[PDB]
């Protein structure tokens, strides 16, 4: 039964065919359980396992490197040399990375908790039910409960399933629907049915939702839906259906891996095409086994050269340091990639109360009737000081302090605000300041009564805590609080029946004091109050009242008006049906207008400027509120979303309007609108769907499980620090202080990371690009192998890793919030940036190969060999006459490879300095700006010396120590990289920046 709320208690029992006395029979229990199923949310199956490791080895590039691991292992064992400990290093270090890199990708245990599993924490263990097999009540597993069961609930008990209330045994039943409403006010339930079939959950005054807990009372009911059919279940299935897409950067890195795969496979064939001359060679000259060794050892060496295998570890460390940086600015980011994608935030949908406002409710203005006489009508406006729940303030008329006790209308004003009120103030000892109890609105009314002091009670003689509820307590002494009529969303008001105490205060029998929506309550007023006297509610007066109501709500004041009326001669205690909620409408009719109070929900202290930041940063901001459209628009004008004087007719919508519009116009509305009022529960997710259709990275916010579906569906799920765990588990970011400013503060930081992160990306790939050029040149010309894969890996991991990670601490841009959000379809490298790191990379290939060739041909301590025979070194012992110098070990010497490797490290430290900025010269920004970069470079070069000196190392990398005679040549060939980059950067700022 889905629409059990719109059915009578007799109908729900007739449908399931159940007896309210004995309940379901064990025969029905099996039949219902087999038809509907167990009352429990489905445990998340199809989880991750060893298969999650397989997913890391799915990409094409990772398979290439994996194949390089297998090919390397094949060439390892099959060899003549007896290199013992330094043989299986090539296959070993490959697995070290393939293991480490795979562990980073499988890392989804400590940095992302499941939201649906956290949602299972709201379903209780056991529940009370009445089965026909026994007399007294019997509790069982909540999962054993079925639709039709006559369940029982009391105070403290957590509701097992969606229950249709049958009968309330206690005086009144209260339930804390905080998880499904957000408003932590214990709502009151009833037995009578709700006429609307498609009524919202808040309107369901006769339902007990699963996950909800009873705040007070005890009642018996019949189970309508169970498990996935419950309100919690319907929310769960929405989250289980929504698939979280990968951040735009992640898609580009995957897209890059595909491009780099084509590059490797292309050159592997290109190398084979260059050696097409071997097809025209004799059989009696060399062997296929000698050739394949060079081809295979080239492919594996070419694979590691192109791949930036150090990148993943570099970014993970950067984002990890980015997480601690964001948490300091009050922004608890959950997932690592979320810190980067946060800068790409295009839209921000935020809630008014709590986030945009301080939620420090306080009555600012209040007007009553001064006198009515024919066409003439005069009011009496006032103003209140003290933007807080504290009583420290005063009332004044027209910027002049007054005594509210001398105004009869204001006396009854405080009377209604005191009696018709469930909230109260409370002084705190720990913090040392007044606090609120109940609703924010009603607490402001309590504070107002304390400020007014209409009876002039003692004030200075009272203590701090004792006077917290002084004037209000004095008011409660006059009238007795018989009973209150609950606040319903259909009439939007609250009244209270009050009988006079044994005091004789001119009390004409019993009275009712009503408060609620101005436009609604004023209509139910046939009379009007003028001090002590009464007059008939005429047109001119009704205009003057509603006009001032509109002036306060639409004006710059942005006040939440609240009309206060009273029923002079209410019906007797007997005639009033105390249970009928719909009858509260006529019980609050024939009222007499007393006055009105205008309160303000003051905006945040920083939102005034934070909104302006979004305007300059090209980020759109969409407010979502519960206030009326007129005031919601006025509030937007005040904070900065709207201008003081501009069009907003089609840029602002209500929940009522948005539904009436067609599907296409709803999408057309979401692209321009930025202010939604009276939003329905399903609107947050709908709006996000329309924002995602425009490829806009959206950031929706929420606090309860009602928003969970919208949060998880959004790119950047924004949750409150005070929100429920389900919201914080479903959110990508959690605001620690619940502020829209800290929302933008994190967005600004996310952009800064994007710049510094993308900087060391082009830095590392630029390194790998030159490594490929070194292999392609040393292979095409047929030179002695310039570099070895065992070396390159340590170069990309440590040598390039330390400085690359240090580039994350680079200074930000002063004009970062001036540019618009980064486009999701924006590449890492393009056009000029491609050529720039292509030339810078292409040079290192000639630097490394040239450094090695330098030792072979024109060197100091090296054997003078010519270029034409140096390219045919593989024919060592064959062509003896041409090769007449030293042992064949000379071509396989450690010196030349050390020259190529040493040059690679030297230029990389220099290229790291070139990567301090994108185009800014080293003259403008010195290389000592980033302190962490210098420290990493000192450590990088320190490690470069260590692998050469400490004997246990140089034998492994096939390298030997270099003296000043050889090191001087390294600086001569390496340092020119800075001058080249300086020329390139100069061309960018001059003949390109336009
Ligand atoms: C982009 C943001 C991702 C977040 C985190 C926390 C980790 C990612 C970082 C991704 C690196 C991608 C690099 C592209 C190059 C081309 C690929 C390799 C060197 C691959 O090795 C050949 C290794 C891929 C590792 C990732 O799958 C692990 C991961 O989650 O890292
Ligand atoms: Na999400």
mmCIF file of N, CA, C and O in Angstrom, residues 63 76 93 169 230 317 397 520 529 546 616 728 775 851 869 925 983:
data_model
loop_
_atom_site.group_PDB
_atom_site.id
_atom_site.type_symbol
_atom_site.label_atom_id
_atom_site.label_comp_id
_atom_site.label_asym_id
_atom_site.label_seq_id
_atom_site.Cartn_x
_atom_site.Cartn_y
_atom_site.Cartn_z
ATOM 1 N N UNK A 63 48.637 -2.324 -20.040
ATOM 2 C CA UNK A 63 48.906 -3.628 -20.633
ATOM 3 C C UNK A 63 50.225 -3.599 -21.399
ATOM 4 O O UNK A 63 50.926 -4.607 -21.487
ATOM 5 N N UNK A 76 65.703 -11.852 -19.580
ATOM 6 C CA UNK A 76 66.529 -11.898 -18.378
ATOM 7 C C UNK A 76 67.240 -13.240 -18.224
ATOM 8 O O UNK A 76 68.467 -13.294 -18.141
ATOM 9 N N UNK A 93 61.723 -4.020 -10.939
ATOM 10 C CA UNK A 93 61.318 -2.629 -10.763
ATOM 11 C C UNK A 93 60.027 -2.326 -11.518
ATOM 12 O O UNK A 93 59.249 -1.463 -11.111
ATOM 13 N N UNK A 169 -2.871 5.977 21.394
ATOM 14 C CA UNK A 169 -3.267 5.597 22.746
ATOM 15 C C UNK A 169 -2.938 6.678 23.770
ATOM 16 O O UNK A 169 -3.718 6.930 24.687
ATOM 17 N N UNK A 230 9.524 1.675 1.241
ATOM 18 C CA UNK A 230 9.426 2.754 2.216
ATOM 19 C C UNK A 230 10.007 4.045 1.651
ATOM 20 O O UNK A 230 10.636 4.039 0.593
ATOM 21 N N UNK A 317 50.102 12.519 -3.825
ATOM 22 C CA UNK A 317 50.759 13.215 -2.727
ATOM 23 C C UNK A 317 50.352 14.683 -2.711
ATOM 24 O O UNK A 317 50.213 15.288 -1.649
ATOM 25 N N UNK A 397 9.939 54.087 18.563
ATOM 26 C CA UNK A 397 9.082 54.520 17.465
ATOM 27 C C UNK A 397 9.698 55.698 16.719
ATOM 28 O O UNK A 397 9.894 56.771 17.290
ATOM 29 N N UNK A 520 -2.947 35.221 4.655
ATOM 30 C CA UNK A 520 -3.963 34.231 4.964
ATOM 31 C C UNK A 520 -4.769 34.565 6.205
ATOM 32 O O UNK A 520 -5.998 34.493 6.196
ATOM 33 N N UNK A 529 -8.555 45.384 15.874
ATOM 34 C CA UNK A 529 -8.318 45.909 17.212
ATOM 35 C C UNK A 529 -7.669 47.285 17.170
ATOM 36 O O UNK A 529 -6.748 47.528 16.391
ATOM 37 N N UNK A 546 -1.901 45.010 4.451
ATOM 38 C CA UNK A 546 -1.220 44.183 3.461
ATOM 39 C C UNK A 546 -0.195 44.975 2.654
ATOM 40 O O UNK A 546 0.772 44.410 2.146
ATOM 41 N N UNK A 616 32.832 37.332 -10.602
ATOM 42 C CA UNK A 616 34.080 37.585 -11.312
ATOM 43 C C UNK A 616 34.706 36.287 -11.808
ATOM 44 O O UNK A 616 35.385 36.268 -12.835
ATOM 45 N N UNK A 728 26.533 13.521 4.625
ATOM 46 C CA UNK A 728 27.980 13.687 4.619
ATOM 47 C C UNK A 728 28.678 12.501 3.960
ATOM 48 O O UNK A 728 29.789 12.632 3.451
ATOM 49 N N UNK A 775 65.889 7.314 -27.269
ATOM 50 C CA UNK A 775 65.822 5.916 -27.675
ATOM 51 C C UNK A 775 65.666 5.778 -29.185
ATOM 52 O O UNK A 775 66.214 4.858 -29.793
ATOM 53 N N UNK A 851 75.632 13.466 -25.622
ATOM 54 C CA UNK A 851 76.550 13.332 -24.498
ATOM 55 C C UNK A 851 77.249 11.979 -24.534
ATOM 56 O O UNK A 851 78.433 11.871 -24.215
ATOM 57 N N UNK A 869 81.839 4.286 -38.135
ATOM 58 C CA UNK A 869 82.114 2.976 -37.558
ATOM 59 C C UNK A 869 81.498 2.846 -36.170
ATOM 60 O O UNK A 869 81.305 1.739 -35.667
ATOM 61 N N UNK A 925 60.211 36.016 -11.759
ATOM 62 C CA UNK A 925 60.167 35.158 -10.580
ATOM 63 C C UNK A 925 61.443 34.337 -10.458
ATOM 64 O O UNK A 925 61.683 33.435 -11.262
ATOM 65 N N UNK A 983 63.690 31.701 -24.139
ATOM 66 C CA UNK A 983 63.339 32.206 -25.460
ATOM 67 C C UNK A 983 61.897 31.852 -25.810
ATOM 68 O O UNK A 983 61.163 32.671 -26.363
#
